[PDB]
Amino acid sequence: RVQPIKLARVTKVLGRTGSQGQCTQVRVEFMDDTSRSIIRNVKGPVREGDVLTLLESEREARRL
Amino acid sequence: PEKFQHILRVLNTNIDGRRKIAFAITAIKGVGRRYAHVVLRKADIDLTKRAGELTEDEVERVITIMQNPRQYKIPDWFLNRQKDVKDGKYSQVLANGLDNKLREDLERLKKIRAHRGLRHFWGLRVRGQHTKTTGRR
Amino acid sequence: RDKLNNLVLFDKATYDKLCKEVPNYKLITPAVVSERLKIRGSLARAALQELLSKGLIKLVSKHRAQVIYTRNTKG
Amino acid sequence: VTVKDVNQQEFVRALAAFLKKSGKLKVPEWVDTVKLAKHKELAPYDENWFYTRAASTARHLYLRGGAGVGSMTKIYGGRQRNGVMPSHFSRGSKSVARRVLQALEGLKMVEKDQDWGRKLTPQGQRDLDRIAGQVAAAKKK
Amino acid sequence: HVAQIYAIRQSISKALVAYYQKYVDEASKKEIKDILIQYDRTLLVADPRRCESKKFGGPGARARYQKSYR
Amino acid sequence: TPDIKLFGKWSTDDVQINDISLQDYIAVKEKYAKYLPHSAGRYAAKRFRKAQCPIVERLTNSMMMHGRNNGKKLMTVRIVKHAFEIIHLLTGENPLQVLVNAIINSGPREDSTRIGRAGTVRRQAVDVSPLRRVNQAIWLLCTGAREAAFRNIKTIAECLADELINAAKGSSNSYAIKKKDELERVAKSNR
RNA sequence: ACGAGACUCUGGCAUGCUAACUAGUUACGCGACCCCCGAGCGGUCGGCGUCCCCCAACUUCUUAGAGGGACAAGUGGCGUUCAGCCACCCGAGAUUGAGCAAUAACAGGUCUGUGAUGCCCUUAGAUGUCCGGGGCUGCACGCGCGCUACACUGACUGGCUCAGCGUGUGCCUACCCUACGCCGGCAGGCGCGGGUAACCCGUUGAACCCCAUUCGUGAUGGGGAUCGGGGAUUGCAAUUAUUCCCCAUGAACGAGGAAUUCCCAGUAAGUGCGGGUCAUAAGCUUGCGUUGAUUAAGUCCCUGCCCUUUGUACACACCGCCCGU
């Protein structure tokens, strides 16, 4: 088990649905390697271009 | 300091030797927080000594003072048995001798067949409350 | 439930038990004393009042709900 | 200095020293057994509270004069916890309050001024400001 | 008690804000005002928020007594 | 912008953040640092007006809870200021550095949110934005403090200080950090 | 054309306006009065619990009249580039809260509000009225709105200081609000001096909260039910205890299952105060102010609503209809 814990920036907020409006999709980029723009859902307020903490980067978590 | 005069007996009623003297006295029936707090004043005792402090030489004052309130200029309005339909003895009362009075006075209602006793004979509410919802424990 | 047996007196053994140890505590409050010992705060607040008089423990803040004391700058 | 530049909570304690030093105003025969109000459940722990109570009411006369029994009973009030029912406001004792004022009369501290309201004599003010010169001289915030 | 404090901390400030204009230079306002505003807005601007009325139904403005269901 | 940033008792400066993900929200020099923690009442207007209060101020606001205590702020101000003296005694460094490294150490990196995954509304592990991670811990640590001091003899400035000082070196000991992993642990258990 | 919106009231702020002994004045004159009450020998200073007539200065606060003010206006994004939205300096940024409220109805409540009333009942052994004593409150039970807590951020005790709506006396009718002095621990009492009220209550000098002592996790002093004895009040009558005071007994309860309600800003939530009922008076309700958050800026997942497209064997309309031993 390697432990890749990646920091990341959103670019734009996509939508805010999935259970009751709780979650929120974004297309977060990484800040430090302008690399895979993983589109993942987060729960809570999301500013414009705000930093983000992230355990595993390999979901894509899109419209399931 | 040393354990000198902790848990003891008086008026056949235990005394919580650990606590303060003021509320330890209240462990007896017929005495409350205030009646305790005044007799301590009239015996001229510092409240800030636990019960394991001062020996019998001081409580010997309290036991007699408590038994007879009137003799030490105790305002009679503290006393819980004033102008009773018994012999008009104006005195604070004490351990189970007091509950005898409670049995007596209730019996007085039940010996004459009055209203209040007639309800105590059943054990329901006597002060004229309701039992629509309350009355069940 | 179970008692805590926080006693209402001293015994000349527990007292000197206190006298060496605590002035090296960075945290000297009535709460931590009664956690360490099986004693009520009333004695400990008084015992700290006793000990404060000697000069072995110094004052940071004496407040209605809590008081704070520290080490005597032993080193 | 003046009373309006010093700590009031310690000031009343300071004057509680003075009336112990004079020690001749009066101490009522009932100080043992009264309650100081109709809402409290237990008389004060300090038995020498008359030096304290008379320190307050005399002090309050320095700031809102013309006060009789009422304006001294109104200040002495708090929750009147009827227990199950909600609490309320309940004024302090009447007689205990006036006996302070009469006792101050004997000491000539206060007087009944025009409008029938207790005020303070120009010698009476001297005592109140004098002790202020002592607490102030021994305490800087 | 707290209301008075939030008054005196404003009145004193707006006193000196108003003082320096009438007999001292306008810049003496701005060297002070900007240092005042960039610390706290309220020391210059009064708190507009004030308690609102109460409606029947609810001990407060917008709470409600519960509803009973058979 | 006064002569220097100071509490009059502690000093604000040199309080560092160990994440790039919590600045702009862990506010210790927004443009300043207030001498005394107590609001002006402006805040809570827009969804990100809540990230301009000092972190100490918001923690002051979250100590009021569970009935009898509600609405009494000056009582908390007393607790918080005392609680920082206690932390500075046990461990040293400015309790802001203790609190900062503590409030970081109690917010989960993840949560398990309901969403459609398997026909019925399942739970898919999700990610938590920075605001929800500071907000979770701040009310999570109060929960430990309120629970801890509910029946102990310990003074509140003791238990809150004792609880926070665990977190800055969090080792599965402080109630908040005990939960923090357990929030992640269950989150990683279902995906 | 109706409803919405538009309108009325309310809150914000206007160092501008006409004004104020029943308001502020308070800035002042320091016209005086007082304490060495302190740096100050002392004055000037700081204070007054104070004292003034108007021949002082007015209106910031106090009050309320006209005003005035905010309108997607300024700028930038997004938009079929129309309607409009998002963000920002400015500032009350269009956003305080209500009142008001259409079409068609319900066999929704009210004949116990009415000299508003149809019919029936009854009218002298009255179902009319008046009087007496009771009952509407009774206890193995289950219910629905609520106050109290279960405690140490707490309780007991002392000091401390702050509020806003109103309200208050002779009415076809019987008693109002209460300073101030004495008696009484208190609950209360006796002379009494104001008010038909910006005038005296009341500069409403309220509470939780602010600072000290005691209690020490223990059904403890948390809790204040129950029961006995006493002491006063209003009234023709308090007993089935009108209230209130005092001593005293000190129980149930260790933060509460299934369920379920209320809320998004000075709102939740805590504490206290008015009005209403009221001769005696609130655990209720109608209002006022103080202390002051966490959690949202969103979605139809649940209970529900509006419009459109489709389906029906429903039409007192799914609480429908309807099939067979």
Swiss-Prot record, chain A:
Function statement: Component of the small ribosomal subunit. The ribosome is a large ribonucleoprotein complex responsible for the synthesis of proteins in the cell. Part of the small subunit (SSU) processome, first precursor of the small eukaryotic ribosomal subunit. During the assembly of the SSU processome in the nucleolus, many ribosome biogenesis factors, an RNA chaperone and ribosomal proteins associate with the nascent pre-rRNA and work in concert to generate RNA folding, modifications, rearrangements and cleavage as well as targeted degradation of pre-ribosomal RNA by the RNA exosome.
Gene from which this protein is expressed: RPS28
Cellular component aspect of the GO annotation: cytosolic ribosome; cytosolic small ribosomal subunit; nucleolus; rough endoplasmic reticulum; small-subunit processome; synapse
InterPro entries on file: NA-bd_OB-fold, Ribosomal_eS28, Ribosomal_eS28_CS
Subcellular location field: Cytoplasm, Cytosol; Cytoplasm; Rough endoplasmic reticulum; Nucleus, Nucleolus
UniProt feature coiled coil, ranges: none
CDD domains given in the database record: S1_S28E (cd04457)
Name assigned to this protein: Small ribosomal subunit protein eS28
Keyword line: Acetylation, Cytoplasm, Endoplasmic reticulum, Nucleus, Phosphoprotein, Ribonucleoprotein, Ribosomal protein
Source lineage: Eukaryota, Metazoa, Chordata, Craniata, Vertebrata
Phosphoserine: residues carrying this PTM: 37
Highest taxon listed in the record's lineage: Eukaryota
Curated annotation (Swiss-Prot), chain C:
UniProt subcellular location: Cytoplasm
Recorded GO MF terms: structural constituent of ribosome
Domain of life where this protein originates: Eukaryota
Predominant cellular place of this UniProt entry's protein: cytoplasm
Assigned keywords, A-Z: Acetylation, Cytoplasm, Ribonucleoprotein, Ribosomal protein
One BP annotation, GO: rRNA processing
Modified residues (N6-acetyllysine): 3, 12, 20, 26, 54
N6-succinyllysine: residues bearing it: 12, 54
Any one cellular-component term (Gene Ontology): postsynaptic density
Known function: Component of the small ribosomal subunit. The ribosome is a large ribonucleoprotein complex responsible for the synthesis of proteins in the cell.
Entry's family note: Belongs to the eukaryotic ribosomal protein eS25 family.
Assembly mode: Component of the small ribosomal subunit.
Name of this chain's protein: Small ribosomal subunit protein eS25
Species for this entry: Oryctolagus cuniculus (Rabbit)
Residue window of the full protein shown: 40 to 114 of 124
From Swiss-Prot, chain D:
InterPro entries registered for this protein in UniProt: Ribosomal_eS19 (IPR001266), Ribosomal_eS19_CS (IPR018277), WH-like_DNA-bd_sf (IPR036388), WH_DNA-bd_sf (IPR036390)
GO terms, biological process: ribosomal small subunit assembly; translation
Modified residues annotated as N6-succinyllysine in this record: 140
Record's keyword annotation contains Ligase: no
SMART domains assigned to the protein according to its UniProt record, in alphabetical order: Ribosomal_S19e
Chief localization: cytoplasm
GO cellular component, one term: nucleolus
SUPFAM superfamilies for this protein: Winged helix' DNA-binding domain
Pfam family, one: Ribosomal_S19e
Subcellular location: Cytoplasm; Nucleus, Nucleolus
Residue(s) carrying Omega-N-methylarginine: 64
GO molecular function, one term: RNA binding
Key word Ribonucleoprotein present: yes
Keywords: Acetylation, Cytoplasm, Host-virus interaction, Methylation, Nucleus, Ribonucleoprotein, Ribosomal protein
Positions where N6-acetyllysine occurs in the chain: 20, 108, 112
Similarity comment text for this entry: Belongs to the eukaryotic ribosomal protein eS19 family.
Assembly notes: Component of the small ribosomal subunit. Part of the small subunit (SSU) processome, composed of more than 70 proteins and the RNA chaperone small nucleolar RNA (snoRNA) U3. Interacts with RPS19BP1; the interaction is direct and mediates the integration of RPS19 in state post-A1. Interacts with RPS19BP1.
Its biological purpose: Component of the small ribosomal subunit. The ribosome is a large ribonucleoprotein complex responsible for the synthesis of proteins in the cell. Required for pre-rRNA processing and maturation of 40S ribosomal subunits. Part of the small subunit (SSU) processome, first precursor of the small eukaryotic ribosomal subunit.
Protein name, entry field: Small ribosomal subunit protein eS19
Organism, scientific name: Oryctolagus cuniculus
Swiss-Prot record, chain E:
Superkingdom classification of source: Eukaryota
Protein localization: Cytoplasm; Nucleus, Nucleolus
Protein family according to the UniProt entry: Belongs to the universal ribosomal protein uS9 family.
The protein's assembly and partners: Component of the small ribosomal subunit. Part of the small subunit (SSU) processome, composed of more than 70 proteins and the RNA chaperone small nucleolar RNA (snoRNA) U3.
Role: Component of the small ribosomal subunit. The ribosome is a large ribonucleoprotein complex responsible for the synthesis of proteins in the cell. Part of the small subunit (SSU) processome, first precursor of the small eukaryotic ribosomal subunit. During the assembly of the SSU processome in the nucleolus, many ribosome biogenesis factors, an RNA chaperone and ribosomal proteins associate with the nascent pre-rRNA and work in concert to generate RNA folding, modifications, rearrangements and cleavage as well as targeted degradation of pre-ribosomal RNA by the RNA exosome.
Name by which UniProt lists this protein: Small ribosomal subunit protein uS9
Species of origin: Oryctolagus cuniculus (Rabbit)
Encoding gene per record: RPS16
